[PDB]
């Protein structure tokens, strides 16, 4: 789950998830947050574990 520029679509987003995080994106559903941000739910292919991809980017 990532906060994401409003100016990006489901495409440029899934492109930036693959690149920067090396992972495979099953599907993206974006909504916009009451404070004027775009939240993204990016689901990873079952081939990956998100819990593990998470604390590799360093948050937990």
């Amino acid at each position: 789950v990532f906060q994401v520029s409003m100016k990006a679509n489901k495409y440029q987003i899934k492109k930036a998830v693959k690149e920067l995080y090396e992972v495979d994106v099953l599907k993206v559903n974006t909504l916009v947050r009451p404070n004027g941000t775009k939240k993204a739910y990016v689901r990873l292919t079952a081939d990956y574990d998100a819990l593990d991809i998470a604390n590799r980017i360093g948050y937990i």
């Binding site: 916009v32 009451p34 404070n35 004027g36």
Partner: protein
Amino acid sequence: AQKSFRIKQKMAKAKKQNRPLPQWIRLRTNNTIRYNAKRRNWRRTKMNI
């Protein structure tokens, strides 16, 4: 219900500003602020869209 973005955006700048003073502002030097003057509330001042 289903709202224009232009509206749902100004709604956001609205919510974002509805907050008490940051209390650290009070400590600043030659600081004349005390409370948040411009504070709004839904039931009191309607925004006019």
